[PDB]
Amino acid sequence: VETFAFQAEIAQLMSLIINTFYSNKEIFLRELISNSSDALDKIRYESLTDPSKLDSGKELHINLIPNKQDRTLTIVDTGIGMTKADLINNLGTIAKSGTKAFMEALQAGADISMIGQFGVGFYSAYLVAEKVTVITKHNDDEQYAWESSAGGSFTVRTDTGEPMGRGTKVILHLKEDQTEYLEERRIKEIVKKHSQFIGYPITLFVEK
Ligand SMILES: Cc1c2c(n3c1CCCN1CCC[C@@H]1CNc1cc-3ccc1C(N)=O)CC(C)(C)CC2=O
Resolution in A: 1.6
- What CATH number has the domain bearing residue 49? 3.30.565.10
**Total domain count for the chain?**
1
What span, in angstroms and rounded, lies between the C-alpha atoms of 61 and 67? 20
Experimental determination approach used: X-ray
Q: Kindly report the CA angle at 148 between 192 and 104, in degrees rounded to 5?
A: 70
Nearest-CA residue for ligand 1 atom 5 is 122
Torsion of CA 91, 96, 99, 100, to 10 degrees: -160
Q: How many CB atoms lie within 10 A of CB 105?
A: 16
Whether residue 87 has its Cβ less than 6 Å from ligand 1: yes
Give the per-residue SS3 of the chain. CEEEECCHHHHHHHHHHHHCCCCCCCHHHHHHHHHHHHHHHHHHHHHHHCHHHHCCCCCCCEEEEEECCCCEEEEEECCCCCCHHHHHHHHHHHHHHHHHHHHHHHHCCCCHHHHHHHCCHHHHHHHCEEEEEEEEECCCCCEEEEEECCCCEEEEEECCCCCCCCEEEEEEEECHHHHHHHCHHHHHHHHHHHCCCCCCCEEECCCC
Q: Ligand 1: which of 31, 33, 38 to mutate, most ligand atoms within 8 Å of CB? A: 38
Tell me if 122 is assigned to a ligand binding site. Answer: yes
Tell me if 55 is assigned to a ligand binding site. Answer: no
What span, in angstroms and rounded, lies between the C-alpha atoms of 152 and 194? 30
Structural domain boundaries, residue 21: 1-208
What span, in angstroms and rounded, lies between the C-alpha atoms of 205 and 67? 9
Cα distances from 196 to residues 9, 34, 160, 200, in angstroms, run 32, 11, 35, 10
Q: Which residues contact 55 (CB under 8 A, 6 or more apart)?
A: none
